[PDB]
Amino acid sequence: MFPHLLSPLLQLLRALVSGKSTAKKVYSFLDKMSFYNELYKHKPHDVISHEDGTLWRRQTPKLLYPLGGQTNLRIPQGTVGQVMLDDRAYLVRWEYSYSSWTLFTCEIEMLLHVVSTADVIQHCQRVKPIIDLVHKVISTDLSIADCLLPITSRIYMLLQRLTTVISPPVDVIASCVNCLTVLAARNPAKVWTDLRHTGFLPFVAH
């Protein structure tokens, strides 16, 4: 279902990673994700048949992220997809293998600008578990931390902008802090440089 259903997959991954020493299987899963589940942009892509098949279809190229920086997620044609719900929505499963971390670390950034357009869809709640997972993964992996970060700078930007007087985002703020804490071991200088102009703390200005 993920990312279509964001919460369950992310939550399960987060919990397991910390607890299990079998970091590799879970982690490898995040780096190499065979499946992608999302809402469907509309119309022309080919379909292949068996049964009355709402289910099976084939693709031409598509860009998850339309114009707004070269960095884009494009899925080569020939990838198979399936239309799961057939109910209220054009929901499709995509065989496209991708890296979850790299993908998420593209999605959130788009949230800031809004310059780019996203097939995925935006929401704050997803923000709370997504960052936490990043947080947990990095913390757990901490050692082989260096390879792990797709989200150094963006998260801080999210934090500054994020600052709200609200519960759902307030929760998100915690996640940002957590990521920073885990990030600290790997790149200590950076966290501190960030804190110099972190909005929360600076009393010094007078």
Place this chain on the structure above:
Amino acid sequence: LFKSRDPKPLHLLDCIHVLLIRYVENPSQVLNCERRRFTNLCLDAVCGYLVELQSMSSSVAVQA
């Protein structure tokens, strides 16, 4: 903006340089010598002033 940016901001430095020069001449309060040397950097003339005397600039100064 100056300090916050990790970067070159040559432009900001220049403009601030122009700003300080613009400001000192306008009020008599700020006026004088420690200044000419100033060619915008974190060599804030005011910054030094603040450390010793205090942060209290004064009331807001506005362009006439």
